[PDB]
Design a protein around this ligand. Structure first.
Ligand SMILES: *[C@@H]1O[C@H](CO)[C@@H](O[C@@H]2O[C@H](CO)[C@@H](O[C@@H]3O[C@H](CO)[C@@H](O)[C@H](O)[C@@H]3O)[C@H](O)[C@H]2NC(C)=O)[C@H](O)[C@H]1NC(C)=O
Ligand SMILES: *[C@@H]1O[C@H](CO)[C@@H](O)[C@H](O)[C@H]1NC(C)=O
Ligand SMILES: *[C@@H]1O[C@H](CO)[C@@H](O)[C@H](O)[C@H]1NC(C)=O
Ligand SMILES: [Ca+2]
Lengths: 243, 155, 527, 330
């Protein structure tokens, strides 16, 4: 459905079927760590080891469908598009779903002119809220904070809000050395990448099992489905281009 | 400053000058935002008499005003020549570093780039009744008509 | 971590009464940027970090100046750049295609900095034989891997300041980059936006390579434009903003204010906020001293003690100013018509004791046909034969004239090197949309080892302030300076752009009348 | 409810010479509104044929103003020009739209739009009947523009396209469009050509074209999360206010303009999906700096300059045959 997306007739279910990524020879995957205030947070994040231990296996599995150019980046004083509302009930801050479409524009101004190819870039931001709104949460549909504190855009990357706690010291505020749990971050980032390439959950028949998650991250038959869709989409694109 | 001297063919029987020798004094308004590639020349042709003392004052007052402005794309050269036209010829020859009239001078320590336009204010009175433009050059040459149109519109 | 940042602002009151401000943002990375596998960037910008590995670069110097540094009336600059866009790069030995990589790199830099560096073509590009030596560590300067281009008519605005500011770690949000308001930086008589990448060693004993990125911004505030009054030269007056909290990423964040008088050995300039300390050193030629404001000092700048450094400075009386900086040039165009002229560049040696060698590099864009047999170097009224002469001629539309000469400037004297050229007529589809404005002759480069008033010391590039580590000092009693002359506006003869079709008809009609006359004579029999 | 995802923008000023400051101000006002409403710099291909922002003639450097009061600098502190000066040609413009740019062109200087991309294209400058002058030299005609738009649609390089032109007789630049999803605005109609002229005393040249000035004023009052629609922008400039009659054109758009938000082209409201899935990962000798002026080394690097003389082979060869001809005749 995503592969064709132009030869099948359109109806109410026509945009979510065009959500996943276009076919391309390569993909840039930039892991950007957003640090709005280095004065309060001194964020370090094993990103080299994180990539090697979790993304490179996943990207090697996914590499049957194209080359990947994973990079990392730290953006300082990278503010968000909207001010989170302060809840006067739990001493926290929130971002409702309504304001989420307007939250990544200022930072996506920063990510530009930092890519070294014409391939579609997938930006994965790890926002680290400043002390002004240090306990920041994202609310799914009605009040309830989301489990992963993250969201993603159809063909853009994804954004995860990463909160630090238990940072109490004696004297005034110093830059606290914040260590980022790369397992926790890469779980949501690889789930978002899987969703961005259109690999949904296995969509079972009435009775079956799955053998659970694979060490690489995604099942091989899912890779084969991706190659089927890529082949059909590529052939359709080539014939349209030739005519 | 530019020191210039000239051997006239004969005493000219008009200014009693045979061995012309004088100094041109010019100051360059350096266009701040520009790279000093084009220039405009405001010149007062001082002579050996009392005339054009107000034109020098007006030139210096305009230099005082133009200096302090950031909107200059061209340098402004404020040139006070020694003689009515021999000084102007000396400065114009040494500026382009040609020797068209065989007049000797000192090397110019400073230029302002390609000159685009030039104004030759003569004014020997404080108040003025009318302003008399003159557009006819050596060998019958004329300035581009837009300069005179510009003058007439600002009148 | 591995990479460090240090930001510095040096305020120099110029001898003419102007005040020059230079911003330096040096990032040093102890990483292997020359090869692939450095995909993780923290302080060194990813955009520029990728370039070194992708295109095999050793040094990348790209500057975006407006204005011209008046060396005669100002002093010698810490770093000068030509008007327009200057880009010279040293490639690695393992490139094997220097011009293709140069084209790709110029296009990518045009994309990054939003300038027209895609106009850098074989007609603008020049391979200096030995002028632009690498500024970092070099195994051997081959000059086969050096490319150099300049676009004199390349405007710099916040069009180039925004991409330039995006590359800073404290990206114009805190520290010393808050004084970078565009309307105040471009309200000036000189503005520079250079970015420099060069192989700098890791420690005291330079046995390994660490990459340094300098983002410099030199700006000169005119006294009559900006001050025009008796108010002090405050940071607020010149930048419309004081100094708030420093850049937390910066390992060192300092402001240097030059407080040095001449014909006086005491009585420095008065700066209102008592500075942290005083740094006296031989900087270019003279033992000049600075007041230091360490932004990483809570005593100097609290969370609520914003710093507004004030400087009392006005154009000193002529019996109280430095004479002249022992070397300045002045390029101009001789002749007055079209079809012919002379590129002449006076270069002055005002030292009345010491001749010194000067390397003059000229690039002329192949529509001013140079006649090298007309190249004269007088230097005293006598004739001065250059020690080293190199001249590549220009092939129409594919290469410019390059002229490199080692002229020994004799004494306090003026050396007038001149060369005659003839203006070319181009095709009607070869002039710019403003053909009557003219064409730009690129500013000529003037590399010299000017003698110093007092002998300098060998100082490591870590203890020294950022303005004292631009050039790799070699001798000690002589300091290296690279002057740029003015860009020259040369007009070419122009064809009538409104008559391309009538000309074809008229010339073909002359051909046709010849054809008809010869037809009616070679075929018509008399009767 | 629109299906777009990208929200690109191409803003073009085909004018030089600092008395066309009005056109640079038009482009920069559209740019300011678009960048305030969400579209990133990377997705805006801005073209300013001349800076006029901080060229030396500007009384206020690094600023472009919309009004005589000088209180809204459309050339803000955050601006990127992808194509400027001599780069802004009809050739380069059609290259950017059709994708036929030279391969060395970077990302920021191209329109990398896809089938899910909303594109806003704003052209400003001198313009006559069904043609737009590029820097007073060359020409783009409505035929070429329509052909380029068709070529974009053939590859599905836009989802919906909003064309706005602010030139004289600008309603005829969108008179030859056939690509399926394009709606077009224009400052004036086929005929009206009267060009307004009220130069600001402070800034010597004219400020705006009075149509994008009201478009700017209309766009200044909306937020990124605004529900204003295209029907509220189809009457932003009445006949009482701009002398010319601004005419729109919706013969191609499938969607009703009253449902098309103005943020669908001015600004980027991204579709947001809350992620709930999780992958459950297992868990010697020193180096020297170069010598800047090695005077001794660079003199000896060149072979000694000796006066040239012809080789002995040529002199012997030529002289021998000169004598040879002397003997066939004698
Ligand atoms: C343009 O050409 C004329 C000649 O056609 C140059 O005039 C010459 O100027 C020199 C000075 O540099 C004169 O030489 C001087 O002669 C006196 C007396 O003999 C001597 O005491 C001085 O030491 C000096 O040598 C020379 O006489 C004079 N020639 C003529 C015919 O008057 C003129 O200098 C050229 N223009 C420029 C800008 O150089
Ligand atoms: C992807 O990587 C493989 C491995 O070397 C290479 O052969 C291929 O050319 C790459 N793809 C592209 C589009 O360059
Ligand atoms: C600033 O810092 C030092 C010590 O904290 C001192 O000058 C002063 O107490 C602080 N506050 C102000 C307002 O200067
Ligand atoms: Ca852009």
């Amino acid at each position: 459905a995503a592969a064709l997306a132009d030869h099948l007739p359109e109806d109410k279910w026509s945009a979510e079927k065009r959500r996943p990524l276009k076919s391309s020879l390569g993909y840039e995957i930039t892991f950007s760590l957003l640090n709005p205030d280095p004065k309060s947070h001194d964020v370090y994040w094993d990103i080299e080891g994180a990539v090697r231990r979790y993304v490179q296996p996943f990207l090697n599995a996914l590499g049957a469908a194209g080359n990947f150019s994973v990079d990392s980046q730290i953006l300082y004083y990278a503010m968000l598009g909207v001010n989170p509302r302060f809840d006067s009930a739990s001493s926290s801050y929130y971002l409702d779903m309504h304001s989420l479409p307007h939250v990544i524009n200022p930072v996506e101004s920063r990510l530009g002119s930092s890519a070294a190819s014409l391939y579609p870039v997938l930006n994965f931001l790890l926002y680290v809220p400043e002390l002004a709104h240090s306990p920041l949460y994202i609310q799914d549909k009605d009040g309830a904070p989301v489990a992963t504190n993250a969201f993603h855009s159809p063909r853009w990357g994804g954004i995860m809000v990463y909160n630090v706690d238990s940072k109490t010291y004696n004297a005034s505020v110093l830059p606290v050395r914040v260590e980022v749990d790369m397992v926790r971050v890469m779980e949501v980032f690889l789930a978002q990448l899987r969703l961005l390439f259109g690999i949904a959950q296995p969509q079972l028949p009435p009775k079956c099992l799955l053998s659970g998650p694979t060490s690489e991250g995604l099942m091989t038959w899912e890779l084969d489905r991706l190659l089927w869709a890529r082949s059909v989409e590529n052939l359709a694109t080539a014939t349209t281009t030739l005519t | 400053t530019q020191s210039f001297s000239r051997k006239l063919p004969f005493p000219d029987e008009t200014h009693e000058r045979y061995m012309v020798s004088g100094t041109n004094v010019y100051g360059i308004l350096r266009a701040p935002r520009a790279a000093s590639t084009e220039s405009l020349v405001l010149t007062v042709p001082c002579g050996s008499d009392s005339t054009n003392s107000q034109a020098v004052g007006l030139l210096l007052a305009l230099a005082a005003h133009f200096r302090g402005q950031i909107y200059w794309a061209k340098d402004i050269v404020f040139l006070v020549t020694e003689h009515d036209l021999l000084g102007t010829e000396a400065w114009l020859e040494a500026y382009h570093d040609v020797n068209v009239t065989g007049m000797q001078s000192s090397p110019l320590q400073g230029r302002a780039g390609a000159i685009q336009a030039a104004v030759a204010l003569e004014l020997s009175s404080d108040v003025v009744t009318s302003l008399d433009v003159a557009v006819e050059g050596l060998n019958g040459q004329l300035p581009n008509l837009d300069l005179l149109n510009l003058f007439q519109t600002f009148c | 971590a591995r990479d460090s940042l240090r930001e510095e602002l040096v305020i120099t009151p110029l001898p003419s009464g102007d005040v020059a401000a230079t911003f330096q943002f040096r990032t040093r990375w102890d990483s292997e940027l020359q090869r692939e596998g450095v995909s993780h960037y923290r302080l060194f910008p990813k955009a520029l970090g990728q370039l070194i590995s992708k295109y095999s670069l050793r040094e990348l110097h790209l500057s975006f100046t407006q204005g011209f540094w008046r060396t005669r009336y100002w002093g010698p600059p810490f770093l000068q750049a030509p008007s327009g866009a200057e880009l010279w790069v040293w490639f690695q030995d393992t490139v094997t295609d220097v011009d293709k990589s140069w084209k790709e790199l110029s296009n990518v830099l045009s994309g990054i900095f939003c300038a027209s560096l895609n106009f850098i073509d074989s007609t603008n590009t020049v391979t200096p034989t030995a002028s632009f030596k690498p500024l970092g560590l070099a195994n051997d300067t081959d000059h086969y891997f050096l490319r150099y281009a300049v676009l004199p008519r390349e405007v710099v605005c916040t069009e180039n300041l925004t991409p330039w500011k995006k590359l800073l770690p404290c990206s114009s949000k805190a520290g010393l980059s808050v004084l970078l308001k565009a309307d105040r930086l471009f309200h000036t008589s000189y503005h520079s936006q250079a970015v420099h990448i060069r192989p700098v060693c890791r420690n005291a004993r330079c046995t390994s390579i660490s990459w340094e990125l300098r983002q410099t911004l030199s700006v000169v505030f005119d006294a009559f434009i900006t001050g025009q009054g008796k108010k002090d030269w405050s940071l607020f007056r010149m930048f419309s903003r004081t100094l708030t909290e420093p850049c937390p990423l910066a390992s060192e964040s300092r402001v240097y204010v030059d407080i040095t008088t001449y014909n006086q050995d005491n009585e420095t300039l008065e700066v209102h906020p008592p500075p942290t300390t005083t740094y006296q050193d031989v900087i270019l030629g003279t033992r000049k001293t600075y007041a230091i404001y360490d932004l990483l000092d809570t005593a100097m700048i609290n969370n609520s003690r914003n710093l507004n450094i004030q400087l009392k400075w006005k154009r000193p009386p002529e019996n109280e100013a430095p004479p002249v900086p022992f070397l300045h040039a002045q390029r101009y165009v001789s002749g007055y018509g079209l079809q012919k002229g002379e590129l002449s560049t006076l270069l002055y040696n005002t030292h009345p004791y010491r001749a010194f060698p000067v390397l003059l590099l000229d690039t002329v864009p192949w529509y001013l046909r140079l006649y090298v047999h007309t190249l004269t170097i007088t230097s005293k009224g006598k004739e001065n034969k250059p020690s080293y002469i190199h001249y590549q001629p220009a092939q129409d539309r594919l290469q410019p004239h390059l002229l490199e000469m080692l002229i020994q400037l004799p004494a306090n004297s003026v050396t007038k090197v001149s060369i005659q050229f003839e203006r070319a007529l181009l095709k009607w589809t070869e002039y710019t949309p403003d053909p009557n404005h003219g064409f730009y002759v690129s500013p000529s480069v003037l590399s010299a080892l000017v003698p110093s008033m007092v002998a300098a010391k060998p100082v490591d590039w870590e203890e020294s302030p950022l303005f004292n580590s631009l050039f790799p000092v070699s001798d000690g009693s002589n300091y290296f300076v690279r002057l740029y002359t003015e860009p020259l506006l040369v007009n070419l003869p122009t064809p009538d752009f409104s008559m391309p079709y009538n000309v074809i008809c008229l010339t073909c009609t002359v051909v046709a009348v010849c054809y008809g006359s010869f037809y009616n004579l070679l075929t018509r029999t008399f009767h | 409810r629109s299906g777009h995802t990208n929200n690109w923008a191409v803003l073009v000023c085909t004018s030089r010479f600092w008395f066309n400051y009005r056109h640079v101000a038009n482009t920069l006002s559209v740019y300011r509104s678009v960048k305030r409403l969400g579209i990133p710099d990377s997705h805006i291909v801005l073209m300013l044929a001349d800076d006029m922002a901080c060229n030396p003639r500007n009384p206020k450097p690094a600023t472009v103003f919309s009004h005589k009061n000088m209180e809204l600098n459309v050339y803000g502190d955050d601006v990127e020009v992808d194509y400027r000066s001599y780069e802004v040609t009809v050739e380069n413009f059609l290259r950017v739209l059709t994708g036929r740019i030279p391969p060395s062109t970077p990302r920021s200087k191209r329109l990398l739009s896809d089938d899910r991309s909303n594109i806003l294209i704003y052209m400003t400058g001198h313009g006559g009947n069904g043609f737009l002058k590029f820097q007073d030299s060359e020409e783009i005609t409505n035929i070429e523009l329509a052909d380029a738009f068709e070529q974009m649609w053939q590859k599905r390089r836009y989802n919906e396209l909003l064309f706005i032109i602010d030139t004289c007789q600008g309603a005829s630049m969108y008179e030859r469009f056939y690509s399926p999803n394009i709606m077009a605005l224009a400052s004036s109609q086929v005929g009206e050509d009267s060009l307004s002229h009220q130069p600001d005393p402070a800034i010597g040249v004219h400020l705006m074209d009075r149509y994008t000035f009201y478009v700017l004023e209309f766009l200044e009052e909306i937020n990124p999360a605004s529900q204003t629609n295209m029907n509220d922008l189809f009457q932003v400039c009445p006949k009482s206010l701009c002398v010319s009659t601004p005419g729109h054109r919706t013969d191609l758009f499938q969607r009703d303009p009253k449902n098309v938000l103005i943020t669908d082209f001015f600004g980027s409201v991204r579709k947001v999906e809350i992620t709930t899935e999780t992958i459950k990962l297992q868990q010697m000798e020193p180096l020297k700096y170069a010598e800047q002026l090695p005077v001794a080394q660079i003199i000896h690097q060149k072979p000694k300059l000796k006066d040239w003389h012809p080789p002995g082979g040529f002199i012997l060869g030529l002289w021998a045959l000169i004598i040879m001809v002397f003997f066939k005749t004698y």
